Write a protein that binds this ligand. Structure first.
Ligand SMILES: Cc1cc2nc3c(=O)[nH]c(=O)nc-3n(C[C@H](O)[C@H](O)[C@H](O)COP(=O)(O)O)c2cc1C
Ligand SMILES: [Cl-]
Ligand SMILES: [Cl-]
Length: 156
């Protein structure tokens, strides 16, 4: 009952959630939301305020926002897509909490993201460098995500 695909994603304002729905449909994967214990408020997401929760977390590479629930088994999956918004050219720190809360061995892991304009390159490189034991697959920025842009990425 293995060899399945998981599409895991974090989304604060729904943009990455909609791109992840399109990815899950395109790969016939299980749609899974990475849930913070404390949801990000408008004040938390204030990029201009150096004291906002997101500003503090993104200034600290060791920050690990807690998850809402413990992670279930990932044994049934051989492929895991991980989606997120780009925050300050990086994956939000909850993505580090997620990766550090399960066993990703023997799995292909593919990052995808949405952004205001930044590329996924730095965010992806930092994930590869911090988790060199994972079989990273080439990631993709999915801005203005549609059934057609996602179909093209998956069909190659
Ligand atoms: C704290 C914070 C930092 C951000 N930093 C970046 C950035 O470095 N580059 C970028 O192009 N967009 C940046 N954005 C914009 C988001 O990546 C973009 O709006 C994303 O699509 C939001 O996705 P979501 O609705 O799934 O949460 C930032 C947004 C927030 C809240
Ligand atoms: Cl709010
Ligand atoms: Cl690793």
């Amino acid at each position: 009952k293995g060899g399945k695909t998981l599409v895991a994603y974090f989304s604060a304002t729904g943009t990455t959630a909609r791109a992840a729905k399109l990815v899950a449909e395109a790969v016939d994967g299980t749609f899974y939301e990475i849930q913070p214990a404390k949801k990000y408020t408008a004040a938390d997401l204030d990029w201009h305020d150096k004291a906002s929760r997101s500003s503090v977390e993104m200034s600290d590479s060791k920050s690990r926002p807690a998850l809402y629930s413990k992670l279930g088994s990932l044994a049934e999956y051989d492929t895991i897509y991980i989606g997120f918004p780009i925050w300050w050219n990086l994956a939000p720190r909850i993505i580090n909490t997620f990766i550090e809360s399960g066993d990703f061995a023997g799995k292909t892991v593919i990052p995808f993201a949405t952004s205001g304009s930044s590329s996924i390159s730095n965010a992806e490189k930092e994930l590869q460098t911090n988790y060199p034991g994972i079989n990273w697959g080439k990631g993709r920025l999915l801005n203005g995500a549609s059934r057609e842009t996602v179909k093209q990425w998956i069909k190659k």
